[PDB]
Amino acid sequence: KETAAAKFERQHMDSSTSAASSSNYCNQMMKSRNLTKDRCKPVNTFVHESLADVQAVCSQKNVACKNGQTNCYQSYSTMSITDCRETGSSKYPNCAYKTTQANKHIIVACEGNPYVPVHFDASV
Ligand SMILES: Cc1cn([C@H]2C[C@H](OP(=O)(O)O)[C@@H](CO)O2)c(=O)[nH]c1=O
């Protein structure tokens, strides 16, 4: 039902805050973006930049994805991100996440017309 571009937006964009300011950020966000509905998604990164700035990464440095594909792009500049990772104690339906805020380059895979992000590969 969901398009790949829409799924990327839902899972990875949070332009409403400039950074995670709370250890509970990931618990709240993972739930509100419906990433804990049927299982606990083990890892997920939110990006705190405008949608335009993230879409613009598809015209920046072309690099290999972890899987060997060559439609990945690394941002020229660092971006505000929050990594959310399940803790060792987490068990569905009570998903529990560690929140780690950082400023780093992002790497996304791009596809389509318009050519936009569809997968979050990594941050560096
Ligand atoms: C390593 C890493 C993976 N992931 C993601 C990308 C994926 O979802 P997606 O491909 O929908 O963007 C996923 C594995 O399926 O874990 C992050 O969101 N942040 C990370 O730092």
Ligand 1 pocket member 120 (CB < 6 A): yes
Write down the experimental method used for this entry.
X-ray
Is residue 113 classed as helix, strand or coil in its secondary structure?
Answer: coil
In angstroms, the CA 80 to CA 58 distance is: 17
Ligand 1 pocket member 119 (CB < 6 A): yes
Strands (E), 10-113: 43-47, 61-63, 72-74, 79-86, 97-104, 106-111
- CB of 86 closer than 8 Å to CB of 95: yes
Tokens 């839902």 sit on residue: 10
Beta-carbon contacts of 49 under 8 Å, excluding residues fewer than 6 positions away, are 15, 79, 80
CATH superfamily of 1-124: Ribonuclease A-like domain (3.10.130.10)
User: What resolution (Å)?
Assistant: 1.5
Chain breaks in the chain (C to N over 2.5 A) after: none
In angstroms, the CA 85 to CA 102 distance is: 14
Selection from 82, 79, 78, 103 nearest residue 29 by Cα: 82
In angstroms, the CA 108 to CA 124 distance is: 12
The residue whose CA is least distant from atom 7 of ligand 1 is 120
Distance 123 CA to ligand 1 centre (A): 10
Name the residue type at position 120.
Answer: F
Percent helix, percent strand, percent coil in the chain, to nearest 5: 20, 35, 45
In angstroms, the CA 35 to CA 86 distance is: 12
